[PDB]
Each structure stands twice: as C-alpha cells, then as structure tokens.
Structure 1
Amino acid sequence: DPEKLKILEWIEGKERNIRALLSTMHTVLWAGETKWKPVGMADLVTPEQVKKVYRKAVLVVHPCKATGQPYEQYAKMIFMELNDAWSEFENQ
C-alpha cells in the first residue's frame, strides 16, 4: 500500500545510515503527527547530536504509544529500522 511503500523506499535509499534516516524521518511520518520538527544535518554532526536526536525519534515512533493507532504498523517499521541504524552507529 502507499503508506508502507513510502517507508520501505525510505529504508532502501538511506542504507542504515542513522543521520540520513533521522534527517528525513519527517517525510515518512503519518499525517497527523505534530511532535516532530524536521532536523538538518547541521544538528546531526557529533555523536552527542545523533544520540540526542535518536532518543527523540524513538519516542515519537514507539510501538507502545502507537498501540491501537491507525498508523501502528508504520510506527513499528520505522522504530525497527532506527534501532538497527543506531546499533550500526554504536558498532562503528
């Protein structure tokens, strides 16, 4: 479907690159979402910045808050890709 294609294209292009995923997460969020301000690379340079923004990303898309919601399935998808992105970032 159109909402799921979006996210799956997003993941594909951004290559588990956390910065790339964070600085573009606002393009895949469900219409309705207000708790997320778009973030530029300017605010994703240092590992402090990546961390601080990542911990803000996962809150928005957390599968617990998303439980029951019409977008639940997409919150999950983004969560999981971000977790993997971040662990790749931790291992680097």
Structure 2
Amino acid sequence: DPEKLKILEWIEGKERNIRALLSTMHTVLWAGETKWKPVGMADLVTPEQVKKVYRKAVLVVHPDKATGQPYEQYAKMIFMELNDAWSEFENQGQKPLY
C-alpha cells in the first residue's frame, strides 16, 4: 500500500535520528490523528525537551492503542523507529543541540 511506502521513504535518511524523526513525524501520521502537533528543531534543544516530545510521540503511535486499527501497521513501524532512535540518543550521551 502507498502509505507504507511513504513511511519507508520517511525512515530512509533519518534512521536512528530522534530529532529528525520527531520534527517531521506529522508528515507521516494517518488522517484523523488529532493529538499530535508539529514540532520544530527549536523545541528539541535540551535533552529534557526531546524526552518530553518523544514521550508524547510514543503515546500517539503506541501499538497497543492501534491494535485493530487501519493504521495499526503504520503506528508499529513508526514506534520501533522512535524507540531505536531514542536508544541511540542515549548511547550518545543525550547531548544537547547546542
């Protein structure tokens, strides 16, 4: 399906980059999603900011909440990528943007 390709294209280039994924995730969310709000790089400076934004993203694409939904598969792909990116962020010392 189309949507799935849009997701792969999205992942391509940003793999394991948490800030890159969060700041553009609104470009891949499914239609109808209301909780999430576009986020820019200026809101992902401090580690605290990132974690806060990551936490809100994970709740929006959480699998257990998507089980039985048309976007279930999409939420899972996004979920994994976010968690892997966070894990990577930790392995980097969670360095501030500047």
* Shorter-chain TM band: over 0.9
SS in 1 for 2:39: coil
Q: Which runs of 4+ in 1 moved over 6 A?
A: none
Hey, what's the Cα distance between the residues in 1 that align with 2:62 and 2:12?
21
Which residue matches 1:85?
Answer: 85
Deviation, 1:15, is 2.9
SS in 1 for 2:68: coil
TM-score (norm 2): 0.90
Deviation, 1:76, is 0.3
TM-score (norm 1): 0.96
Q: What fraction of aligned residue pairs are identical, expressed as a percent?
A: 99
User: Could you give the per-residue CA deviations for residues 16-59 of structure 1, whole angstroms, max 9, x where no partner exists?
Assistant: 21000000000000011111000011100111011000000000
For the aligned residue pairs, the C-alpha RMSD in angstroms reads 0.7
Q: Which runs of 5+ in 1 are unaligned?
A: none
Report which of the two has the higher share of helix. 1
Hey, what's the Cα distance between the residues in 2 that align with 1:7 and 1:87?
20
Q: Which runs of 5+ in 2 are unaligned?
A: 92-98
Hey, what's the Cα distance between the residues in 2 that align with 1:40 and 1:70?
28
Hey, what's the Cα distance between the residues in 1 that align with 2:82 and 2:40?
17
Give aligned pairs, total.
91
